[PDB]
From a paper:
To understand precisely how [name] recognizes NADPH, we obtained co-crystals by using calcium instead of magnesium to inhibit the activity of WT [name] and to stabilize the [name]•NADPH complex. [name] forms few contacts with the nucleobases. The adenine is sandwiched between two arginines (R290 and R367) via cation-pi interactions. The density for the adenine is relatively weak, indicating that these interactions are relatively dynamic. In contrast, the ribose-5′-PP-5′-ribose-2′-P backbone of NADPH forms multiple stable contacts and has better electron density. The 2′-P of NADPH is placed in a chemically ideal position for dephosphorylation. In [name], the phosphate coordinates with the catalytic metal ion, which is positioned to stabilize the leaving group (ribose oxygen). The orientation of the ribose near the catalytic metal ion places the 2′ ribose position rather than the 3′ ribose position for chemical attack. This can explain the inability of [name] to cleave RNA. In the [name]•NADPH complex, the α5β5 motif packs closely with the nicotinamide-bearing sugar.
Residue numbers in the entry: 120 to 132, 141 to 425
Write the structure that this text describes.
C-alpha cells in the first residue's frame, strides 16, 4: 500500500508544531531487534534514511524530538540544517549500538528547531539518574524564545529504559527528569512540552508521576479519543521472535494551563498498517511519529 504519511490525518482539536519520533537506530534495526516478518531489504540504511526525511518533510514541524538517532552527524544534522533546523545531539553513555560489528556509533536523543522561528535561550544535556544511580538514559531540555512574540517555552526530549522488569527503574528516571524540569522552568513559570519514548504503558508508575506532577502536564494524544480521557491504543506495533508487540510508549506532555492542543496526527488502522506491521518497505520505524500543533493560551 501507500506510505503511512499519505494515510494519517490531522484531527482538528502562529501555531507551533511539535513532532515526537523514536526513529529506530540503524544498528539496532539490523542487529538486535529481530524483526522476523520485516524484509531485510526494507531495513537498509539508504532506504530508511530517505523514509525518515520524507516523514519530516511531510509534516514541516517547528520542533523535532527524536530518539535512537545513530546517524546524527552524518545525516540528520547536516540535512536538516540545510532546511533551517538548529540541532543538538546527546548520546547514551553506553549505547547498545556499539554491540553491532558494523554500527555507526552510539544512539541518543536529538532536538531540532527552526532557527527562523526561535532563539535558543538555554540548553541542558541531562544524564538521568535513578535515586542517584547514574543510568544509561539521557534527556535534552532547551528554553526557546519565539522571535515573533517573545514568548519563552521549554522543550524536552527523553528515552527511558526499555523492557519489562524496569518499572521501578523507569519511575526513578522520570522523577529525576521532572526534578530537572522543575529547576529549568523556574517552578512552571515557563511553559513546558516534554516529548519522549517512555518505554512504559499508561499503567506504569512513571506515567502516573507525570500525570500527577505539580507541573500540571497533560498528554496531547489523549485528545484523539472520543472524550479526550484515554491514551491511544498504540504508538508502536511490530512482530518479534518473542511475538507481536502492540502498545503505547510514546507521549507528548504539555502544560495544561499554558498551552492548547490545536491538532494531532491520527494513527493507522489495523487494515492500513498491513499484516506485517512496522517497519516495512514504506515506513522506517516500529514507532509512529506523533505530531501536534500547539498555541499559547490568550
Ligand atoms: N558498549 C559496549 O561495549 C557494550 C554494550 N552493552 C550494553 O547493552 C545495554 C543496552 O543499552 P540500553 O540503553 O539499556 O537499552 P534498553 O534496554 O533501554 O532498550 C533496548 C533497545 O532495543 C529496543 N528493544 C525493545 N525491546 C527489545 C527486545 N525485546 N529486544 C531487543 N531490543 C529491544 C529498544 O527500543 P524501544 O525503546 O522502542 O523499546 C531499545 O532501543 C547498554 O547498557 C550497553 O552498555 C552490552 C555489552 C558491551
Ligand atoms: Ca527500538
Amino acid at each position: 500500500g501507500p506510505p503511512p504519511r499519505f494515510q494519517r490525518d490531522f484531527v482538528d482539536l502562529p501555531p507551533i508544531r511539535v513532532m515526537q519520533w523514536n526513529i529506530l537506530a540503524q544498528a539496532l534495526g539490523e542487529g538486535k531487534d529481530n524483526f522476523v516478518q520485516c524484509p531485510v531489504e526494507a531495513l537498509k540504511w539508504e532506504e530508511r534514511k530517505c523514509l525518515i526525511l520524507e516523514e519530516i518533510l511531510a509534516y514541516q514541524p517547528d520542533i523535532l524530538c527524536l530518539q535512537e538517532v545513530d546517524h546524527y552527524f552524518d545525516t540528520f544534522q547536516p540535512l536538516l540544517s540545510r532546511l533551517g533546523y538548529q540541532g543538538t545531539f546527546f548520546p547514551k553513555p553506553w549505547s547498545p549500538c556499539l554491540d553491532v560489528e558494523h554500527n555507526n556509533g552510539p544512539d541518543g536523543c536529538a532536538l531540532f528547531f527552526l532557527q527562523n522561528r526561535f532563539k535558543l535561550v538555554n540548553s541542558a544535556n541531562i544524564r538521568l539518574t535513578a535515586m542517584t544511580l547514574k543510568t544509561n538514559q539521557v534527556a535534552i531540555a532547551q528554553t526557546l524564545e519565539c522571535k515573533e512574540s517573545g514568548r519563552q517555552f521549554c522543550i524536552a526530549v527523553t528515552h527511558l529504559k526499555a523492557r519489562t522488569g524496569w518499572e521501578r527503574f523507569r519511575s526513578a528516571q522520570g522523577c529525576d527528569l521532572l526534578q530537572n524540569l522543575q529547576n529549568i522552568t523556574q517552578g512552571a513559570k515557563i511553559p513546558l512540552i516534554v516529548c519522549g519514548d517512555f518505554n512504559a504503558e499508561p499503567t506504569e508508575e512513571v506515567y502516573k508521576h507525570f500525570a500527577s506532577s505539580s507541573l500540571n502536564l497533560n498528554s496531547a494524544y489523549k485528545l484523539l479519543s472520543a472524550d479526550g480521557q484515554s491514551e491511544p491504543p498504540y504508538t508502536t506495533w511490530k512482530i518479534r521472535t518473542s511475538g507481536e508487540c502492540r502498545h503505547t510508549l510514546d507521549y507528548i506532555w504539555y502544560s495544561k494551563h499554558a498551552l492548547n492542543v490545536r491538532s494531532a496526527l491520527d494513527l493507522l488502522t489495523e487494515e492500513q498498517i498491513g499484516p506485517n506491521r512496522l517497519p516495512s518497505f514504506n515506513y522506517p520505524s516500529d514507532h509512529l511519529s506523533l505530531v501536534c500543533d500547539f498555541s499559547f493560551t490568550e
